[PDB]
Amino acid sequence: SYRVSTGAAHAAKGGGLVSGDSYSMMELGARKYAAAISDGRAHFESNETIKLLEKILESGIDEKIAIKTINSILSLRTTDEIYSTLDLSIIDLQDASCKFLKVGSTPSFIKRGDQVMKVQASNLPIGIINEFDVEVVSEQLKAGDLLIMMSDGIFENHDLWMKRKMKGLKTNDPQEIADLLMEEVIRTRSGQIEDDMTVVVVRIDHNTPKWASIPVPAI
Amino acid sequence: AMSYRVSTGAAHAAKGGGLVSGDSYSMMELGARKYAAAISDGRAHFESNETIKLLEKILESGIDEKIAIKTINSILSLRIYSTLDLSIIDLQDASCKFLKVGSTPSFIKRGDQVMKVQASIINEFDVEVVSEQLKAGDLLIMMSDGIFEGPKHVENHDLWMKRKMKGLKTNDPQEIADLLMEEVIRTRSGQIEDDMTVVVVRIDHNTPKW
Amino acid sequence: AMSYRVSTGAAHAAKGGGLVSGDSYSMMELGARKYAAAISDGRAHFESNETIKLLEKILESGIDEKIAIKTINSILSLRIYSTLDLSIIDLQDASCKFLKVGSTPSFIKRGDQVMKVQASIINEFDVEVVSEQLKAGDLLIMMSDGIFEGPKHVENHDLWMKRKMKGLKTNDPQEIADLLMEEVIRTRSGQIEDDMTVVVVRIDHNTPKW
Amino acid sequence: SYRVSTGAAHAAKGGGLVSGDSYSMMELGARKYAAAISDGRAHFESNETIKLLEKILESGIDEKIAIKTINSILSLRTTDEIYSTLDLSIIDLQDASCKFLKVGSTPSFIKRGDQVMKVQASNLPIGIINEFDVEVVSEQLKAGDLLIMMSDGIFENHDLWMKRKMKGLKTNDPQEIADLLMEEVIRTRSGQIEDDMTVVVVRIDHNTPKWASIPVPAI
Ligand SMILES: OC[C@H]1O[C@@H](O)[C@H](O)[C@H](O)[C@H]1O
Ligand SMILES: OC[C@H]1O[C@@H](O)[C@H](O)[C@H](O)[C@H]1O
Ligand SMILES: [Mn+2]
Ligand SMILES: [Mn+2]
Ligand SMILES: [Mn+2]
Ligand SMILES: [Mn+2]
């Protein structure tokens, strides 16, 4: 299975504000990659069901209600497949603010400098029924953040292992960090595994290329 | 001013991998606005939009170029969708399908070579459909009108872009994108008459140590 | 001038019916534009649209009226969707859920009785959520501003509509709709200041000979 | 399971042309009925997959291509369920023109006066692969038409039986015609059946209520 490495550059007419151009990309792990440019809407969007989940996150409804509603939405879906687990991270690229939605633990970690914090909510909702083990979190990322997400297989006290090993990373490169973190989990076995393993890593960085600084004429 | 950026990586191992795995992941990026990443334990998380979906299906038919162009037109004449430059890569065998509506155009750089992406009556919406077999190390470059028709006093834009891509002393997609943007902007003088978008994709062999 | 119309019927028998059947059917009508009917042999054919879907899900939660109103508002304040009068009937037990956004309002006629559909802080979009238990022979009547606020010099519109519905000497939905439209139009003089829409639904016992 | 009987009336401001009001309804057989009014889009729409099929019908692409494309669209769907059969009738309410899309025979019949014609294409496409047995038809209906659609169970030379019995109907009322046609199929058994039976009937009629004729002032 081939990988793709991508990159993009975008500039509005009269260097400022909003553009008639749009570009998008999407990757279905190990299967399909798509990229679109349009010169004048979003070329790609979430699932029927993930669209609904996103709308709840986006709303800013209080957290207990969001959890209740997500549970209900999750509640009525095609029994096959049960759509657990779900680990979903949505980064806003204007302010680098990230909303996390988890359905059936994961967990995910944010490495900042040498500090590796786990992605979890400060206030855990109690005194309710949460049948799908739904968790909703809001962190604020900044340039140089490394968000690592993993499945049950690779993740399996495990926080200490991940925390330590993520400090042990001497590289800032996502495709490298992923492969190494895989390597470390596998040699701990010393061979193949019965369970599926996937890890994705995302690095946040602050777009400041030379052409961005080329000045437009004055009057 | 400029929005934040994202650089991503993923590693995947099937159980005794192996044909299949319950696990799946996906990502999508709405340029400059939104990045999403999803992991699920044993129906993709993200998909094309409604109109791109019908066009995507027609591509995936494999029907004759002549009729697909004709049938996509009829579809588009019942919308405007503006222009569309769509590249779809199969990560299993690196084959690629291109759907162009309203031109573009696009280029592939294979070693020192650079070729335009084109297919070997009335075409109302200027539709093209193309297939290619990519290879590890290929660089696919997509761009809007403002980059490609950007250079100030250039007769043959095709030739200008090839020559510039042939001169890229870099296999890094983000550098290439930024370099091509810069070269166009400087032919004017920080002046940006049209919106400018470039997307660069590199095909890699997935073959880590495990 | 006026569009064509449709009058529909369906009969369904499960195998030794019986809890379940591979067969399903559906219909939908986009008022004055489109009618569709589907039969399938062993995922509904038609569904609410994207925004109605989220609102529909919230209704089907069953969450507290106070918070559902509050949560639907927050949802609507991220769109305008205009107004929405939505009635959803469960054909198994004849229970009914109503979602009103931006008023309406609506009425149910049970025998000689006629009651308005209403639920026993800031409500930005004027949202109501209501549940009722309907019964064989009930007549549910829905209408837009132009019908209900239509009558020329009437102080209490609620009372005008009840009195008129109480006087319906007819259990046929299409007749009721046409009669109510006529009564409003004549209070003006063929003059139609606003758009006028009325929808009438009657609940029947399905109990044919078999 | 309850039934609903419905009706509706609609009039644009200043009796003519296009309205800010819209109304819709939908019924999921034996399960759910919904009705919406909006005072200013369609409240209800087809499936993800039926949307795509509809777009192909709507396009006026030639028939062989439409059949090929529908097959491909049909071709890539969730293996469960195989979504065969499909009998789909779409009436345009402006001109009473009906597009039929069939996936795995049915068939459906249009009764006009005492004439009962079967819904099939005049030119059947040959020299192709049609894996889902896709059929696409275009008839023009008129006031007083009775379109009858049925599943494999009730329909089972059967055309002669349906044709005769549909002539034998002495009623113009859809919910009656359906129940009778069920009755006739069942007594032919004389009890219950192993196979599922459903029939839907649609009568086309030409909207001309009294209020439509009430005149608006002249100058
Ligand atoms: O693989 C690289 C790219 O894949 C794309 O589908 C993702 O959207 C992401 O925006 C990029 O990182
Ligand atoms: O049952 C009656 C009604 O059901 C509705 O869902 C259908 O859309 C049809 O427009 C009506 O006939
Ligand atoms: Mn697992
Ligand atoms: Mn442009
Ligand atoms: Mn109005
Ligand atoms: Mn059957």
Author numbering:
A (entry chain B), D (entry chain B): 590 to 629, 635 to 750, 757 to 819
B (entry chain A), C (entry chain A): 588 to 629, 635 to 671, 676 to 716, 722 to 811
Reproduce text from the manuscript describing this model.
SpoIIE from B. subtilis is an 827-residue protein thought to consist of three domains. It has 10 putative membrane-spanning segments at its N-terminus and a PP2C-type phosphatase domain at its C-terminus. SpoIIE belongs to the metal-dependent protein phosphatase (PPM) family exemplified by human PP2C. The pathway of σF activation begins with the dephosphorylation of SpoIIAA∼ P by SpoIIE and culminates in the displacement of σF from the complex with SpoIIAB by SpoIIAA.
The crystals appeared from Tris-buffered sodium citrate solutions at pH 8.5 and belong to the space group P6122 with a = b = 89 Å and c = 319 Å. Native data and selenomethionine (SeMet) derivative data at three wavelengths were obtained from these crystals, and the structure was solved by multiwavelength anomalous dispersion (MAD) phasing techniques. The coordinates were refined against data extending to 2.6 Å spacing. There are two molecules (A and B) of SpoIIE(590–827) in the asymmetric unit of the crystal, giving a solvent content of 63%. In the course of building into the electron density maps, it became apparent that SpoIIE(590–827) in the crystal is a domain-swapped dimer with β-strands 1–3 exchanged between subunits. At the dimer interface, a pronounced cavity is formed between the edges of the five-stranded β-sheets. There is a pseudo-2-fold axis of symmetry running through the cavity whose sides are formed by the β1 strands on each of the two subunits of the domain-swapped dimer. This cavity contained a strong feature in the electron density maps that could not be accounted for by protein atoms. A xylose in two half-occupancy alternative conformations could be satisfactorily fitted into this density and refined. We observed a single manganese ion at low occupancy in SpoIIE(590–827) even though the crystals were grown in the presence of MnCl2 (up to 50 mM). One explanation for this is that there will be competition for metal chelation between the protein and citrate (a tricarboxylate), which is present in the crystallization solutions at 0.2 M. Another is that SpoIIE(590–827) binds manganese weakly.
